[PDB]
Amino acid sequence: ELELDEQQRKRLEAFLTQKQKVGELKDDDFEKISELGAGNGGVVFKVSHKPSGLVMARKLIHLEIKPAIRNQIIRELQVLHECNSPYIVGFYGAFYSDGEISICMEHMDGGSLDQVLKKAGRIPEQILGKVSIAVIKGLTYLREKHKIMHRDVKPSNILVNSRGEIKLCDFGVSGQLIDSMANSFVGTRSYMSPERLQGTHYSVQSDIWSMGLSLVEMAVGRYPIPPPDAKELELMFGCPMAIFELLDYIVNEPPPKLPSGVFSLEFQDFVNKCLIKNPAERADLKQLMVHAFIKRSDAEEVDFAGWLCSTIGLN
C-alpha cells in the first residue's frame, strides 16, 4: 500500500542530492546556530555544516565510552542511509568526537508537536487527521523497508515543518546505542502501552497505543492520565501524581477517552480503537489505515502549513 506522488518523489530526490554533496562528517565542520533543546538522549542544536552550507540538527549524546562501543553504534546507524520516507526525518550521518556521539539529521523548522502543543493550547481535530495519517504511514514504512518498530511514539517525536510535512524521529535503530544508554537519559514510559509496562508481548501494537494517547493529549491540551473531573472540563471546553503511581494507573485502571460532544464520533472511535488495553483486540495498522476517520481525513484538504505558521508564528 506504500505509494508515492510527484511532489513527494521530487522532495525525496532533492534531499538525496543535497546529502550526496556532503562527505564524511567531522566536529570541526559544524557551526552552532541555536539550541532546539533536550532531547531523548542529550542535547539538540540547529547547526550549519560549513563546507556544504546546509542547515542540520545535531544530537549530542555525551557518553565517555571506549572506541569499540561507539564504532559499533555508527555501524548500526548507517542502516538509516537506505531509509527513504516522506514520513521519516532525514538522516545525514553519525560520528564520535571528544566526548559525544553526534547524529546529524534533516532540520524541521516547526519542531516537535510537544512544542506546537504549548503554543496552540490544543490542536484541532482536522489537523490531528493529517498527523494520524502521517504517524500511520511512518510506522507502516518502519515495519516494511526497515523491519523494526518505532518503540517511542510521543508528541516530542513527531516533527513538523513550514512545507506542511510531518515526520517521525528518535526511534530505536541502533540496539547498542540504547544498551549504552542504560544510565544516561532513559525515555519517559508514560506513553508506553499497559503491556510494555508488564514486559509481555510487544509489536507494532504498542506504537498504536502510544499514538492514540499522543492524539488524546494533543486534542485536549493536557496529558490524559489521570482523567480530569467535569470541573476541569468546564475550565477546558465549557460543555499531583508521581511517575510510578501514573504507570501503575495505566496498567490497572480503564483507558483515557476524548470528551463527548466536543469531538466527532469517528475520531472518538479512532482513538478508542487505539487505546484498547488488550493488544489482541487493539486495532492494527491495516484496520486503522482504512478507518472512517482516516478515510475522511485523507479526503479533506486541510491546510496544515497555514495553520502551523499562524500557530507557532513563523516569520
Ligand X SMILES: CCOC(=O)c1ccc2n[nH]cc2c1
Interacting residue with ligand X among 100, 165, 170, 195 (CB under 6 A)? 170
In the complex with ligand X, the residue whose CB is nearer, 39 or 259, is 39
In the complex with ligand X, the residue whose CB is nearer, 49 or 107, is 107
Q: Which residues, at least 6 apart from 296, have a Cβ–Cβ distance to it below 8 Å?
A: 129, 266
For residue 86, state whether it binds ligand X (rule: CB under 6 A).
Answer: no
Does 42 count as an annotated binding residue?
yes
Strand order in the sheet with 111-112: 111-112, 158-160, 166-168
In the complex with ligand X, the residue whose CB is nearer, 94 or 258, is 94
Contact 194, 250 (CB under 8 A): yes
> Catalytic pick from 5, 152, 207, 284?
152
Interacting residue with ligand X among 25, 47, 57, 294 (CB under 6 A)? 57
CA distances to 128, 185, 186 from 182, rounded to whole Å, are 33, 8, 7
**Options 26-34, 154-162, 182-190, 207-215: segment touching ligand X (CB under 6 A):** 154-162
Interacting residue with ligand X among 77, 80, 100, 112 (CB under 6 A)? 112
CA distances to 1, 45, 102, 128, 153 from 50, rounded to whole Å, are 40, 15, 16, 37, 33
- Smallest gap from Cβ 293 to ligand X, in A, equals 26
Task: Clarify whether 303 is annotated catalytic.
Answer: no
181/183 Cα distance (integer angstroms): 5
Name the residue with cell 518498530. Answer: 149
Number of H helices, E strands in the chain: 12, 8
99/70 Cα distance (integer angstroms): 11
For residue 216, state whether it binds ligand X (rule: CB under 6 A).
Answer: no
Name the residue with cell 507557532. Answer: 312
Print the SS3 string covering 142-178. Answer: HHHCCCCCCCCCCHHHEEECCCCCEEECCCCCCHHHH
For residue 105, state whether it binds ligand X (rule: CB under 6 A).
Answer: yes
**Options 18-26, 104-112, 212-220, 221-229: segment touching ligand X (CB under 6 A):** 104-112
- Smallest gap from Cβ 149 to ligand X, in A, equals 17
Does 108 count as an annotated binding residue?
yes
For residue 169, state whether it binds ligand X (rule: CB under 6 A).
Answer: yes
For residue 39, state whether it binds ligand X (rule: CB under 6 A).
Answer: yes
Residues that bind ligand X (CB under 6 A): 36, 39-40, 44, 57, 89, 105-108, 111-112, 156-157, 159, 169-170
